[PDB]
Design an enzyme around this catalytic site. Structure first.
Site, PDB file in Angstrom:
ATOM      1  N   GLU B  70       5.698  10.198  14.245  1.00  0.00           N
ATOM      2  CA  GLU B  70       6.814  10.677  13.439  1.00  0.00           C
ATOM      3  C   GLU B  70       6.964  12.192  13.576  1.00  0.00           C
ATOM      4  O   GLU B  70       5.966  12.910  13.701  1.00  0.00           O
ATOM      5  CB  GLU B  70       6.622  10.298  11.972  1.00  0.00           C
ATOM      6  CG  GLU B  70       5.386  10.887  11.313  1.00  0.00           C
ATOM      7  CD  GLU B  70       5.020  10.173  10.026  1.00  0.00           C
ATOM      8  OE1 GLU B  70       5.730   9.215   9.655  1.00  0.00           O
ATOM      9  OE2 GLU B  70       4.017  10.560   9.390  1.00  0.00           O
ATOM     10  N   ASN B 227      -8.813  19.352   2.972  1.00  0.00           N
ATOM     11  CA  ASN B 227      -8.703  19.821   4.344  1.00  0.00           C
ATOM     12  C   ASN B 227      -9.423  21.148   4.545  1.00  0.00           C
ATOM     13  O   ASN B 227     -10.021  21.379   5.603  1.00  0.00           O
ATOM     14  CB  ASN B 227      -7.229  19.967   4.711  1.00  0.00           C
ATOM     15  CG  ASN B 227      -6.497  18.645   4.709  1.00  0.00           C
ATOM     16  OD1 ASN B 227      -7.108  17.587   4.586  1.00  0.00           O
ATOM     17  ND2 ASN B 227      -5.180  18.700   4.837  1.00  0.00           N
ATOM     18  N   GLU B 253     -26.745  18.526  21.814  1.00  0.00           N
ATOM     19  CA  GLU B 253     -27.973  18.264  21.070  1.00  0.00           C
ATOM     20  C   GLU B 253     -27.791  17.234  19.963  1.00  0.00           C
ATOM     21  O   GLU B 253     -28.723  16.468  19.665  1.00  0.00           O
ATOM     22  CB  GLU B 253     -28.444  19.543  20.384  1.00  0.00           C
ATOM     23  CG  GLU B 253     -28.815  20.684  21.280  1.00  0.00           C
ATOM     24  CD  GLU B 253     -29.597  20.242  22.458  1.00  0.00           C
ATOM     25  OE1 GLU B 253     -30.812  20.083  22.320  1.00  0.00           O
ATOM     26  OE2 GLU B 253     -28.989  20.102  23.536  1.00  0.00           O
TER      27      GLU B 253
HETATM   28  N1  LIG Z   1      -8.165  13.892   3.425  1.00  0.00           N
HETATM   29  C1  LIG Z   1      -6.933  13.632   3.844  1.00  0.00           C
HETATM   30  N2  LIG Z   1      -6.495  12.330   3.911  1.00  0.00           N
HETATM   31  C2  LIG Z   1      -5.243  12.054   4.337  1.00  0.00           C
HETATM   32  C3  LIG Z   1      -4.390  13.073   4.703  1.00  0.00           C
HETATM   33  N3  LIG Z   1      -3.221  12.520   5.082  1.00  0.00           N
HETATM   34  C4  LIG Z   1      -3.313  11.180   4.957  1.00  0.00           C
HETATM   35  N4  LIG Z   1      -4.564  10.876   4.497  1.00  0.00           N
HETATM   36  C5  LIG Z   1      -5.105   9.534   4.217  1.00  0.00           C
HETATM   37  O1  LIG Z   1      -5.141   8.742   5.388  1.00  0.00           O
HETATM   38  C6  LIG Z   1      -4.579   7.474   5.137  1.00  0.00           C
HETATM   39  C7  LIG Z   1      -3.183   7.391   5.725  1.00  0.00           C
HETATM   40  O2  LIG Z   1      -3.239   7.550   7.119  1.00  0.00           O
HETATM   41  P1  LIG Z   1      -2.033   8.296   7.863  1.00  0.00           P
HETATM   42  O3  LIG Z   1      -2.531   9.535   8.560  1.00  0.00           O
HETATM   43  O4  LIG Z   1      -0.917   8.607   6.902  1.00  0.00           O
HETATM   44  O5  LIG Z   1      -1.561   7.224   8.949  1.00  0.00           O
HETATM   45  P2  LIG Z   1      -0.726   7.709  10.224  1.00  0.00           P
HETATM   46  O6  LIG Z   1      -1.664   8.360  11.204  1.00  0.00           O
HETATM   47  O7  LIG Z   1       0.385   8.640   9.818  1.00  0.00           O
HETATM   48  O8  LIG Z   1      -0.170   6.331  10.831  1.00  0.00           O
HETATM   49  P3  LIG Z   1       1.367   5.910  10.652  1.00  0.00           P
HETATM   50  O9  LIG Z   1       1.635   5.664   9.191  1.00  0.00           O
HETATM   51  O10 LIG Z   1       1.641   4.652  11.432  1.00  0.00           O
HETATM   52  O11 LIG Z   1       2.246   7.027  11.149  1.00  0.00           O
HETATM   53  C8  LIG Z   1      -4.528   7.339   3.632  1.00  0.00           C
HETATM   54  O12 LIG Z   1      -5.758   6.871   3.143  1.00  0.00           O
HETATM   55  C9  LIG Z   1      -4.316   8.761   3.182  1.00  0.00           C
HETATM   56  O13 LIG Z   1      -4.874   8.946   1.906  1.00  0.00           O
HETATM   57  C10 LIG Z   1      -4.828  14.383   4.637  1.00  0.00           C
HETATM   58  O14 LIG Z   1      -4.083  15.299   4.962  1.00  0.00           O
HETATM   59  N5  LIG Z   1      -6.100  14.660   4.205  1.00  0.00           N
HETATM   60 MG   LIG Z   2       2.514   8.651   9.892  1.00  0.00          MG
END
Ligand SMILES: Nc1nc2c(ncn2[C@@H]2O[C@H](COP(=O)(O)OP(=O)(O)OP(=O)(O)O)[C@@H](O)[C@H]2O)c(=O)[nH]1
Ligand SMILES: [Mg+2]
Ligand SMILES: Nc1nc2c(ncn2[C@@H]2O[C@H](COP(=O)(O)OP(=O)(O)OP(=O)(O)O)[C@@H](O)[C@H]2O)c(=O)[nH]1
Ligand SMILES: Nc1nc2c(ncn2[C@@H]2O[C@H](COP(=O)(O)OP(=O)(O)O)[C@@H](O)[C@H]2O)c(=O)[nH]1
Ligand SMILES: [Mg+2]
Ligand SMILES: [Zn+2]
Lengths: 275, 442, 430, 34, 442
Positions: B70, B227, B253
């Protein structure tokens, strides 16, 4: 294998030089092991690949080619050598080997029995008991699997989980239990800073069965007695210790490994209430 | 010396923003790619080289790619504050998402985008002279992170071969959840990830929320806090490459010390002085206190309890003003504890590292300023419980074929479910068997 | 001829601090360690108690042992504390708890190797080693346990030397510790096998000395420990200065002990003069002798009138005639003949030394071997039997690991010592 | 920060004996890899 | 050297406020935790270390935890004057009280809260190098003090082992009373306390009210006066660790001298120069007068008369300008008295201590300023009368099961009442048997 790459010769100077210096070479024969004062040692190296017979050929060629050959030795790569000398001087073509010597002869002969005794117990240990992926070797399986409560917590209190302090899935905490005061065998009392030793913090159940009344209340289950799976664990009935908080006896298996000790006493035959 | 970072999907890009903020502020590169060298040091400096390259006009550009299906998050990066820092080719974005389907990412959509990613990574790797691994950021709960992360790691593993690949991975938390189909994607991801990764570090948002409530004093945390914590951890692990120290630790290592058998490569991570300014000023923070901190399960960034297992290996990274004698005294004190257990086949349980550069403080940040810190990654049998709960949730849904028509329509054979579930069952049995004492096996 | 000192426990460390103050004063040693004295007679025997460190300095041949460093921190903070070698302080991390078994068995075996290493390092530095000197209380915990442990180890390692102890013993009227009878009985059992000569002091006798003889308005433990340090430094005076009739620790032992179990002695020091009466009595050998035999001046509760003297010794310091010493000892033996054991023709040894302690014209220290010491042991055995029959506090000792049989051995050995004294008291020529 | 310590070090000019000067590494300024 | 203080519930926290006020004022730490900068003494003293630790910036922080189930009292401490002194982790507060139920504290609520307390105590014990005991303050009349105090002492006794645990305990007064169910909670607490405490000191508010009326000139006393007296007692007992003296007394010495048999560990406490400023100028206060004072029953802080029993051991602590000869003469005169009797198996009845530091004066306090004081703790058979009266009260109510349904509903078997009552009956018989002379039994 013994790979020979060396050979050294002990030669006298030319007869003309002996005549000029003033030494009578007719008296070169002797009944002692001392050498003539004019003899000198000279050594040569062989090629990168050679055999024992090649060394013999070189030694015999040296014997034929120059006068004054007294003795020679062929040096092996393991540190040993074999000495070569004529039986009767002033008469070539009588060369033979008289003896051999290595620097570890008496050294190995003295220490043979202890070496064999220790080796006979070392070799059974080195055999692998697991495959490439760390699985069972088709035998000697443990009676119970690792993750069962009585196997994972054979000699250690299990966790206690509470919701306090967490707004999500609870997590346990660490304790201040100390292991027995056991030092490495023969290693000196070596230390980098002031540390909390285990001579103190001795458990109060050291002799409670003979210098006190033992356990009188049902409160032993709150902190000492735990119910793990279908078994009971008592922290006061584990491995024996002495007054300075160090273990007394060590138990070994038939293969020679060290046992761990168990605090499990009894099997609880739990039945659902049914009638 | 050099390392290349690959950021995938939403979590990986958002964590990347915090990481590159930190690496810029620590080295001193301005947001427009410049270095106001004001010191009178006499000779130039090289610590940036691990993460930045210079053109020759003195602009810096970073060794990273951002991959997403996206546009929105990458377009947000393109329009943000760091617009001029990144090369525009590095920020790659597709048209439409993988809609929480691993099958859609792996088969239908990621297959079109993947060749551009490999061409960019190749163009980076050609401008290197001592590349010593890849760092990968992704989440296994979503569709593009799972599908394209697996496909890309497979391609990288064929093309680059022996080079090490270290993953920081956000796994589905055990009771907070964001999408229904998380178990299917996580199982299929873990199936692909088993063959093609050298060490995998696991993170759970529920643990970092608990840590930010408990240690920091934040009532309403958001992803920027998490993050920033992740960025601090990665900076601690990569500091050994970048600054002078007594005992350095190369990225190679980790794999040698942490992985006993080729499937057993999943490690727990924790960080000690996560602390607020008021607590930091109420307490001294000596070596032994932070060493005691890294072993409490309340310090971990993944929701697992190590008291339900046995440790196999520990790797301890100290940075800042620390002396080796204090490290030795601390590790010996840890070894003394009776509630901390190591498998009996691993007697020499520890690896140490000691670096002189203390952790950097970020202007808007919530962490205190501290003279020393320690970071830990450790391998323990307790990790088997995370897979067991994911597998139980998978069994619950798959017993009724709850969603399978989506996956079959987007290109996947139904057989792949049974294969992956049997592989995870074998992984569970490996973690059960490895933990069995030797005295019982004679 | 070098002495090695050991100070154990609170009482031992405090008395040692006062002793080394007194000794440093007599030899003119500054608390920095620099010699600032005014006669060669001071320098020529300084080796006896001090070792020489570089460019002037002297260090005192003493080992300090305690289980908690609090007393040691007090002595290091004191005015002379700097003189002590830092490496000579040996300490643990938890106290003895006034328990003999703890002090002997648990922290004892933990510390003892470092104490033996220090004691061997100190002994082997001497060019010729004389006996050891130990100060401790018998009623305490680390004093009793570590003192007797160390004494046994040193007797294993140095069996041909002399072993000397100064020891504090429980008062007959008020206890300072509840469990005193056990610790005293076990320590006396250890001493009678290991020791060569032992001196016993009651704190009650020092209090009565201070109040009646010195009439001090507000005495402190510094005064009692000064009296003890005075006699302790006096017994060794003939070792380290010239004189008309030299003497030595071994010569005292040879003249005092008739049979090897009978080695417990009474102590006294004579020239104590009241705070407002010095104008009423001139110094003379008769005056010193009169104070010397007065039971008011003896540092134990038992009185000579209930027993008989086997032997006694007097060491005189000062410029005096030998005739007066000999005729005084003859007159006292002849006039009081019923209090001296008749099958020994002369019970008193004399010795004369030229150099008195600073600010005194003359001084004498008196050591006496008297059978009335049997009354103290009988009292201790009674209190032990009262406590043991009822298991009054026994669980502490048994829980540490002691066999009950040890207590019956110590009781039997002390009872036999009392019987042996009683038999020699009533022996006759026939 | 550490100016007067360096001044004393330069004035005294002590020899190189074990156990004489310690911890000089912890007083550095940059620690960057040159 | 170090000692850790544990304060439980309402009485224990309120007594803690007075204790820490006193220890601050005696050492000289300001309320914000910094030593005054105007003083130029030149020396850099460390005596505080027994009770305070320094961070390194020179702030002081104290070795204590405050535990409560209701928030209000701990929030009052958080908002009070010493707010900046304590580390916020040390102040632990729950949501709701144990409602005068021992069962609620022990089974339901304290079982949830106890692991946080144990983690804080562990964090304290890790920052020590010569810990030599725990001091515990609680009341056995209330629900959380009894139930959580017992549970926590039990856990401490398993975890720390041989280390000593000394309790200061407020027992239910013989006619002053605050709640109906006090006998049940005190019996059930005392059942646990027999096994898991090394010495227990008992206090009754009716005695301290009588003492403050008779000796001080206070017509209308309140709890702050009692708490200041308790603080003075604790300061007297711990002074032996902190200041120079002739005869020091380590915390391990109490258990060895006072306890003859392992169940007989409950001791009476009294304090001598409780006197008002107007009386103080009419009278001299010599050693022998205050020694005579400590033996009058009007001086005791527990409502029992020692003339109804026999002494087994006494421990006398003198602090200030005292000389040993006067202590010996006084104790011999006391020994002469005909109304003081010792059991015939305890011939050597006394332990002495002598410390040079005189008692500190608190700006708002009600005690006069005096150059010397003595404090006594003693073991006597008269103590059997207190338990006998708590028993009749328990028996009268238990005959009709008057309140038991609350305890059974909150998690307790009915059997536990009968077990505890039989154990206290056996303790009564123990006090009968131990006091019988040996001459009578031949
Ligand atoms: N710690 C942390 N978790 C995140 C973050 N963004 C999304 N998540 C978590 O990761 C999961 C969602 O995965 P996404 O990264 O949104 O999935 P994606 O890679 O965008 O995959 P698509 O939806 O198909 O585009 C959920 O459990 C969210 O809570 C982030 O910035 N930091
Ligand atoms: Mg996504
Ligand atoms: N001396 C003294 N006694 C107190 C004090 N506070 C309460 N008490 C007494 O202790 C008993 C009450 O115990 P609490 O401490 O209130 O009980 P709790 O620990 O709060 O238990 P919960 O009510 O369940 O929370 C009564 O006898 C009170 O008189 C105090 O500050 N000083
Ligand atoms: N003369 C004297 N006696 C002391 C001194 N200190 C303690 N004592 C006595 O020694 C006995 C206590 O023994 P202690 O030294 O405390 O034993 P420890 O605990 O093992 O060190 C009691 O009788 C005290 O009166 C001191 O400085 N001088
Ligand atoms: Mg309350
Ligand atoms: Zn309980």
């Amino acid at each position: 294998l013994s790979q020979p790459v060396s050979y050294s010769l002990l030669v006298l100077p030319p007869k003309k030089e002996l005549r000029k210096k003033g030494y009578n070479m007719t008296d070169i024969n002797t009944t002692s092991t001392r050498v003539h004062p004019l003899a000198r040692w000279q050594t040569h190296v062989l090629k990168h690949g050679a055999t024992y017979r090649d060394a013999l050929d070189a030694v015999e060629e040296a014997n034929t080619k120059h006068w004054g050959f007294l003795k020679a030795r062929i040096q092996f790569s393991c540190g040993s050598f074999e000495s070569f000398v004529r039986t009767n001087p002033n008469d070539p073509s009588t060369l033979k080997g008289v003896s051999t010597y290595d620097p570890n002869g008496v050294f190995h002969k003295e220490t043979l029995d202890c070496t064999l005794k220790n080796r006979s117990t070392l070799l059974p240990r080195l055999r692998a008991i697991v495959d490439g992926r760390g699985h069972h070797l088709s035998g000697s399986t443990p009676p119970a699997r690792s993750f069962h409560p009585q196997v994972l917590y054979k000699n250690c209190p299990p966790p206690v989980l509470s919701q306090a302090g967490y707004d999500f899935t609870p997590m346990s905490h660490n304790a201040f239990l100390l292991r027995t005061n056991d030092h490495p065998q023969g290693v000196r009392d070596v230390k980098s800073d002031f540390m909390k030793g285990s001579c103190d913090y001795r458990p109060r159940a050291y002799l409670r069965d003979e210098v006190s009344g033992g356990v009188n209340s049902r409160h032993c289950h709150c902190a000492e007695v735990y119910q793990v799976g279908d078994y009971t664990m008592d922290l006061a009935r584990g491995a024996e210790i002495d007054h300075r908080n160090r273990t007394v006896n060590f138990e070994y298996t038939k293969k020679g490994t060290l046992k761990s000790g168990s605090n499990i006493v009894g099997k609880r035959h739990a039945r659902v209430p049914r009638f | 010396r050099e390392a290349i970072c690959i950021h995938i999907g939403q979590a990986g890009c958002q964590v990347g923003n915090a990481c590159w903020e930190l690496f810029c502020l620590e080295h001193g590169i301005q947001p427009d790619g410049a270095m106001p060298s004001d010191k009178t040091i006499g000779v130039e400096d090289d610590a940036f080289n691990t993460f930045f390259s210079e053109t020759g006009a003195g602009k810096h550009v970073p060794r990273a790619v951002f991959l997403d299906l996206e546009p929105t998050v990458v377009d947000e990066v393109r329009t943000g504050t760091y617009r001029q820092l990144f090369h525009p080719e590095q920020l790659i974005s597709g048209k439409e998402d993988a809609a929480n389907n691993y099958a859609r990412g792996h088969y239908t959509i990621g297959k079109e985008i993947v060749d551009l990613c490999l061409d960019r990574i190749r163009k980076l790797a050609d401008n290197c002279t001592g590349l010593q691994g890849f760092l990968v950021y992704h989440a296994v709960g979503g569709g593009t992170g799972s599908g394209l992360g697996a496909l890309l790691l497979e391609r990288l593993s064929v093309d680059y071969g022996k080079k090490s690949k270290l993953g920081y991975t956000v796994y589905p938390s055990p009771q907070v959840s964001t999408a229904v189909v998380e178990p299917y994607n996580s199982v299929l991801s873990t199936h692909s990830l088993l063959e093609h990764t050298d060490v995998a570090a696991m993170l759970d948002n529920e643990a970092i929320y608990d840590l930010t409530r408990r240690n920091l004093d934040i009532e309403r945390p958001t992803y920027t806090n998490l993050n920033r914590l992740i960025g601090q951890v990665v900076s601690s692990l990569t500091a050994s490459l970048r600054f002078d120290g007594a005992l350095n630790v190369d990225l190679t290592e980790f794999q040698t010390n942490l992985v006993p058998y080729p499937r057993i490569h999943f490690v727990l991570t924790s960080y000690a002085p996560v602390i607020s300014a008021e607590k930091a000023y109420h307490e001294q923070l000596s070596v032994s206190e932070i060493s005691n901190a890294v072993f409490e399960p309340a310090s971990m960034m993944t929701k697992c309890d190590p008291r339900h297992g046995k440790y196999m290996a520990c790797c301890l990274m100290y940075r800042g003003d620390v002396v080796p004698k204090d490290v030795n005294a601390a590790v010996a004190t840890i070894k003394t504890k009776r509630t901390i257990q190591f498998v009996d086949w691993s007697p020499t349980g520890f690896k140490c590292g000691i670096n002189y550069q203390p952790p950097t403080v970020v202007p808007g940040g919530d962490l205190a300023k501290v003279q020393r810190a320690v970071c830990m990654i450790a391998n323990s049998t307790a990790i088997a419980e995370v897979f067991a709960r994911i597998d139980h949730k998978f069994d619950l849904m798959y017993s009724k074929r709850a969603f399978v028509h989506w996956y079959v329509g987007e290109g996947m054979e139904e057989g792949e479910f049974s294969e992956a579930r049997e592989d995870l069952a074998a992984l569970e049995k490996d973690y059960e068997e490895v933990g069995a004492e030797s005295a019982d096996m004679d | 001829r070098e002495i090695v000192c050991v100070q154990a426990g609170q009482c031992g460390n405090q008395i040692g601090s006062k002793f080394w103050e007194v000794i440093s004063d007599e030899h003119g040693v500054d608390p920095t360690g620099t010699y600032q004295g005014d006669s060669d007679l001071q320098l020529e025997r300084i080796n006896v108690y001090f070792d020489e460190a570089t460019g002037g300095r002297y260090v005192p041949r003493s080992v300090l042992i305690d289980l908690e460093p609090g007393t040691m921190d007090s002595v290091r903070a004191g005015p002379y504390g700097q003189i002590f070698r830092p490496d000579n302080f040996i300490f643990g991390q938890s106290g003895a708890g006034n328990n003999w078994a703890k002090g002997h068995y648990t922290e004892g075996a933990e510390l003892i190797d470092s104490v033996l290493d220090v004691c061997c390092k100190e002994a082997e530095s001497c060019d010729c080693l004389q006996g050891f000197q130990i100060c401790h209380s018998l009623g305490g915990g680390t004093g009793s346990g570590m003192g007797t442990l160390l004494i046994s180890k040193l007797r294993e390692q140095y069996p041909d030397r002399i072993m000397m102890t100064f020891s504090i013993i429980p008062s007959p009227k008020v206890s300072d510790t509840v469990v005193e009878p056990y610790n005293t009985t076990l320590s006396v059992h250890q001493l009678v096998e290991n020791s060569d000569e032992s001196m016993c002091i009651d704190n009650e006798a020092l209090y009565d000395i201070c109040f009646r003889t010195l009439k001090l308005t507000t005495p402190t433990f510094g005064d009692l420990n000064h009296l003890v340090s005075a006699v302790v430094s006096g017994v060794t005076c003939c070792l380290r200065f010239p004189g008309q009739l030299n003497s030595d620790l071994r010569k005292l032992a040879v003249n005092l002990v008739p049979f090897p179990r009978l080695h417990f002695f009474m102590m006294g020091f004579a020239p104590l003069t009241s705070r407002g009466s010095q104008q009423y009595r001139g110094l003379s050998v008769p005056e010193l002798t009169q104070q010397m035999f007065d039971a008011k001046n003896m540092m134990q509760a038992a009185d000579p009138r209930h027993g008989r003297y086997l032997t006694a010794s007097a060491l005189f310091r000062g410029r005096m005639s030998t005739k007066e010493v000999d005729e005084q000892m003859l007159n006292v033996q002849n006039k009081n003949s019923s209090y001296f054991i008749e099958w020994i023709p002369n019970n008193i040894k004399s010795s004369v030394c030229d150099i008195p302690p600073k600010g005194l014209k003359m001084a004498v220290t008196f050591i006496g071997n008297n059978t009335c010491i049997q009354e103290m042991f009988r009292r201790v055995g009674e209190q032990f039997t009262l406590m043991f029959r009822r298991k009054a506090f026994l669980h502490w000792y048994t829980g540490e690991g002691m066999d009950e049989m040890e207590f019956t051995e110590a009781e039997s050995n002390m009872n036999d010592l009392v019987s042996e004294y009683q038999q020699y008291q009533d022996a006759t020529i026939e | 920060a550490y100016q007067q310590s360096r001044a004393l070090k330069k004035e005294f000019s002590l020899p190189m004996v074990p156990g004489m000067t310690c911890g000089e590494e912890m007083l550095r300024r940059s620690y960057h890899r040159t």
